[PDB]
Design an enzyme around this catalytic site. Structure first.
Site, PDB file in Angstrom:
ATOM      1  N   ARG A 115      51.328 106.539  89.967  1.00 43.03           N
ATOM      2  CA  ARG A 115      50.444 106.310  91.114  1.00 43.03           C
ATOM      3  C   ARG A 115      49.007 106.140  90.613  1.00 43.03           C
ATOM      4  NH1 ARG A 115      50.252 109.673  96.831  1.00 43.03           N
ATOM      5  NH2 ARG A 115      49.774 111.456  95.477  1.00 43.03           N
ATOM      6  N   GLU A 159      49.808 104.550 104.712  1.00 45.05           N
ATOM      7  CA  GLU A 159      49.152 105.832 104.931  1.00 45.05           C
ATOM      8  C   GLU A 159      47.751 105.662 105.511  1.00 45.05           C
ATOM      9  OE1 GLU A 159      48.010 106.531 100.094  1.00 45.05           O
ATOM     10  OE2 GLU A 159      49.030 108.027 101.344  1.00 45.05           O
ATOM     11  N   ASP A 179      47.919 111.647 104.572  1.00 41.49           N
ATOM     12  CA  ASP A 179      46.797 110.709 104.619  1.00 41.49           C
ATOM     13  C   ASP A 179      46.737 109.991 105.963  1.00 41.49           C
ATOM     14  OD1 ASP A 179      44.899 110.417 102.450  1.00 41.49           O
ATOM     15  OD2 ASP A 179      46.600 109.812 101.172  1.00 41.49           O
ATOM     16  N   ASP A 220      47.091 119.072  98.344  1.00 38.93           N
ATOM     17  CA  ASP A 220      46.343 118.104  97.533  1.00 38.93           C
ATOM     18  C   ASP A 220      45.325 117.432  98.453  1.00 38.93           C
ATOM     19  OD1 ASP A 220      47.638 115.795  98.743  1.00 38.93           O
ATOM     20  OD2 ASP A 220      48.522 115.189  96.821  1.00 38.93           O
TER      21      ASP A 220
HETATM   22  C1  GZV Z   1      52.400 116.770  95.272  1.00 42.43           C
HETATM   23  C2  GZV Z   1      51.854 116.529  96.660  1.00 42.43           C
HETATM   24  C3  GZV Z   1      51.648 117.586  97.530  1.00 42.43           C
HETATM   25  C4  GZV Z   1      51.142 117.351  98.798  1.00 42.43           C
HETATM   26  C5  GZV Z   1      50.854 116.052  99.197  1.00 42.43           C
HETATM   27  F1  GZV Z   1      50.365 115.833 100.425  1.00 42.43           F
HETATM   28  C6  GZV Z   1      51.069 114.982  98.334  1.00 42.43           C
HETATM   29  C7  GZV Z   1      50.728 113.555  98.722  1.00 42.43           C
HETATM   30  O1  GZV Z   1      49.984 112.896  97.964  1.00 42.43           O
HETATM   31  C8  GZV Z   1      51.222 112.917  99.980  1.00 42.43           C
HETATM   32  C9  GZV Z   1      50.754 111.719 100.407  1.00 42.43           C
HETATM   33  O2  GZV Z   1      50.303 110.731  99.524  1.00 42.43           O
HETATM   34  C10 GZV Z   1      50.364 111.570 101.850  1.00 42.43           C
HETATM   35  O3  GZV Z   1      51.122 112.049 102.759  1.00 42.43           O
HETATM   36  O4  GZV Z   1      49.297 110.961 102.135  1.00 42.43           O
HETATM   37  C11 GZV Z   1      51.570 115.230  97.063  1.00 42.43           C
HETATM   38  F2  GZV Z   1      51.777 114.208  96.230  1.00 42.43           F
HETATM   39 MG    MG Z   2      48.513 109.921 100.388  1.00 45.81          MG
END
Ligand code: GZV
Ligand code: MG
Ligand code: MG
Length: 712
Positions: free
Chosen positions: A328, A419, A447, A618
């Site tokens: 990513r 997202e 997001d 995150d």
């Molecule tokens: C490891 C981890 C933990 C919590 C999170 F929310 C994410 C994430 O990045 C999700 C999306 O990209 C989003 O729902 O926008 C993740 F990778």
């Molecule tokens: Mg995201």
């Protein structure tokens, strides 16, 4: 200062040396041609990158104003819709089409199963993730709350056989459900042998084979008494290990030692929301882990080799021992001073990630035995895009990078995150812009929720963040994503993915709940740990995703009116205690995440919420929390006193959860002295003014500030 001049660029020396000494050797790319290509790509594409970002700001300002000048108390949907169409936010839907993406591995086109996301800057987690293609079902059940710790079955410092027997019984039931016997149950099995190329299972009073002999995929050891038996169901492999000399096997009625599940079929090595990397030193640490993954020599603990099996007919075959890796990249927003131009302007970080992660991924197409992609593709997840012009730009960036790297056109494939709202409502056009590169779409719902709040910030106060999960807009968005993928021919060609389970300790609930995603036709969904991948794999054995997708074909299940239904709260729905629970919970999760971000450069952390539920945080979950409080402060649900008091109240509680736990710097009592506390405060009080509510500008500035004070 300590930079290297290449054309108009000034490259941080640590990055220059890493690329020349570590990334370039073995790719047959000439170092001076590479760096000239960096210079030319940065110069050529930076104007369009800036223009796209300006277009975001211009659209948001028009929507902001539109909401401020509304008097009619419930929103007129037909007026709002035609406004969005006039300003170019809502674009025309293209005619039906089918994607043409070729050269894609079977783990993406065909296999439905879990997809694991891990921060690429943590080498040990990255290694465990790559190795999570296979995982122990027994360990995953024994070590978590899927087997309840009732009286008798408690975990302790030593093995509890009462609990182990429940583990065995659970796995026996899974086998009956997934690979049925002709008669009887696996619970009563006493032995396994392979006779005339087929599996025969010993029961106490007879013998039996599988209801479908085709689920027998192979075995290890002598056909007499095999050392394991390999089954397949819905495209995923199951291995019964047979070893009566092991402690578990001694107790088992058929000497079974463990049940191994094919688990994390693919893995996303993350440079974005789960890492903190704010300069060239940080980027190089991540680039170097990605390099060691692709070369195969990353070691903290090492990567696994492929697994050898004897076919049912007697011949030999092999199976991949590693998860197929995506990377990513960061999205279009941020710049990084890893490279600056002659004026001192920072270079766009997404452009750099395409060049450097793409360069490094060439090693994974070459021997150093096993590799990554046997079909010749490089797999890049591109996050946080807004609309089809931003998708077209990513495809052009990848094209120009392929040229610099000497790669065939369309080598670099795109996993599209859905997202951001302007992508959701133009999703068909977004897929079409990448119709020859797209390998998945995924609903990044966290997001997406932050963008929902920021986009309609001026509209009024939003519902509590725990209510968002069930709002009309997000249910339509989930169904719309599946519909669009299926209509574009994703079945058999590309993944239809759904989002992350964040309650890392609530594995019983995950097994009970997360089955909804494959039932919705998703061929993959996100998990946070190898253990969660093994448990989520159970769902793909229960649900025939391929069959589900075929039944969904041709359906239109979301309207644009539903997608555009803003999650405004109704009139005074909250008692004072409910408002303070929301404020305190949001400040606690913000502070727990931000303090380890700023002070320790850790981009994902388990943070207990106000109900003591361990949540993996995150930047996306932070975007939600900060935007919601900014929205409540904007429309007078809370005062600025309320925010500051909550921050001060929760900070010493966060201090305690990190107390001693390594060189950690307490935030309390000297609040105005803590860069981390001030970052958390700024994310709320300046949240309405951040571009699309993104958290990176403040996080990156405050982390660089902390690094500067740690040196003076
Ligand atoms: C490891 C981890 C933990 C919590 C999170 F929310 C994410 C994430 O990045 C999700 C999306 O990209 C989003 O729902 O926008 C993740 F990778
Ligand atoms: Mg995201
Ligand atoms: Mg079936």
């Amino acid at each position: 200062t300590d930079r290297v001049s290449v054309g108009n660029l000034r490259i941080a020396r640590v990055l220059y040396d890493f690329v020349n000494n570590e990334a370039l050797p073995g790719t047959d790319i000439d170092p001076d041609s590479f760096w000239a290509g960096v210079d030319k790509v940065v110069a050529d594409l930076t104007p369009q990158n800036q223009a796209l970002l300006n277009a975001r700001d211009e659209l948001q300002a028009q929507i902001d104003k539109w909401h401020r000048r509304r008097v009619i108390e419930p929103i007129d949907m037909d007026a709002y819709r035609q406004f969005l169409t006039e300003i170019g936010y809502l674009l025309p839907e293209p005619d039906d089409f089918t994607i043409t993406t070729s050269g894609v591995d079977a783990e993406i086109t065909t296999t439905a199963g879990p997809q694991l996301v891990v921060p690429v800057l943590n080498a040990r987690f990255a290694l465990n993730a790559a190795n999570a293609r296979w995982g122990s079902l027994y360990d995953a059940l024994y070590g978590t709350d899927v087997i309840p710790e009732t009286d008798g079955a408690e975990k302790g410092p030593t093995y509890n056989k009462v609990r182990g027997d429940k583990v065995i019984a659970y796995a026996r039931k899974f086998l009956d459900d997934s690979v049925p016997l002709s008669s009887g149950s696996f619970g009563d099995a006493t032995g396994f042998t392979v006779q005339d190329g087929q599996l025969v299972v010993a029961l106490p009073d007879k013998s039996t084979g599988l209801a479908n002999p085709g689920q027998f995929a192979g075995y290890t050891g002598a056909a007499e008494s095999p050392t394991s038996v390999l089954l397949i169901n819905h495209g995923l492999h199951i291995e019964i290990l047979i070893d009566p000399e092991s402690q578990v096997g001694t107790t088992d009625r058929a000497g079974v030692k463990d049940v191994i599940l094919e688990s994390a079929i693919t893995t996303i090595m993350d440079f974005e929301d789960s890492v903190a990397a704010v300069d060239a030193a940080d980027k190089v640490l991540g680039y170097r882990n990605w390099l060691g993954l692709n070369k195969g020599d990353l070691a903290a603990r090492v990567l696994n080799r492929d697994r050898n099996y004897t076919a049912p007919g007697g011949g030999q075959f092999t199976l991949p021992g590693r998860s197929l890796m995506f990377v990513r990249n960061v999205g279009h927003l941020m710049t990084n001073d890893a490279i600056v131009d002659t004026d001192g302007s920072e270079v766009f970080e997404g452009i750099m990630d395409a060049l450097f992660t793409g360069l490094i991924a060439i090693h994974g197409l070459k021997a150093s035995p096993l590799i990554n992609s046997r079909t010749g593709s490089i797999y890049i997840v591109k996050p946080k895009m807004h609309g089809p012009a931003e998708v077209a730009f990513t495809c052009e960036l990848f094209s120009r990078v392929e040229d610099v790297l000497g790669l065939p056109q369309n080598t670099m494939k795109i996993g599209i995150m859905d997202e951001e709202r302007r992508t959701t409502v133009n999703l068909k056009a977004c897929i079409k812009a990448a119709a020859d590169r797209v390998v998945f779409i995924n609903t990044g719902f966290l997001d997406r929720t932050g963008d929902e709040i920021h986009t309609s910030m001026e509209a009024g106060p939003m519902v509590r963040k725990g209510t968002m999960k069930s709002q009309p807009w997000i249910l339509a968005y989930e169904d719309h994503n599946v519909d669009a993928g299926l209509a574009a021919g994703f079945s058999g060609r590309a993944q239809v993915g759904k989002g992350m389970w964040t309650m890392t300790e609530l594995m019983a609930d995950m097994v009970e709940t997360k089955i909804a995603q494959p039932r919705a036709g998703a061929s993959t969904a996100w998990v946070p740990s190898p253990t969660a991948a093994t448990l989520h794999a159970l769902h793909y054995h229960q649900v025939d995703v391929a069959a589900v997708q075929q039944g969904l074909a041709g359906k239109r299940r979301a309207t644009i009116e539903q997608l555009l239904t803003i999650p405004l709260a109704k009139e005074l729905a909250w008692a004072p205690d409910e408002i303070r629970e929301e404020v305190d919970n949001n400040c606690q999760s913000i502070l727990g995440y931000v303090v380890r971000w700023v002070d320790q450069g850790v981009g994902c952390s388990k943070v207990p919420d106000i109900h003591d539920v361990a949540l993996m945080e995150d930047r996306a979950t932070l975007r939600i929390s900060s935007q919601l409080l900014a929205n409540w402060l904007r429309h007078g649900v809370i005062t600025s006193a309320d925010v500051r008091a909550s921050l001060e109240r929760m900070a010493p509680l966060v201090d305690r959860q990190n107390a001693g736990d390594v060189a950690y710097r307490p935030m309390a009592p000297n609040f105005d002295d803590s860069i981390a506390f001030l970052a958390a405060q700024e994310l709320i009080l300046s949240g309405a003014q951040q571009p699309n509510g993104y958290t990176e500008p403040i996080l990156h500035r405050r982390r660089r500030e902390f690094k500067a004070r740690a040196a003076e």
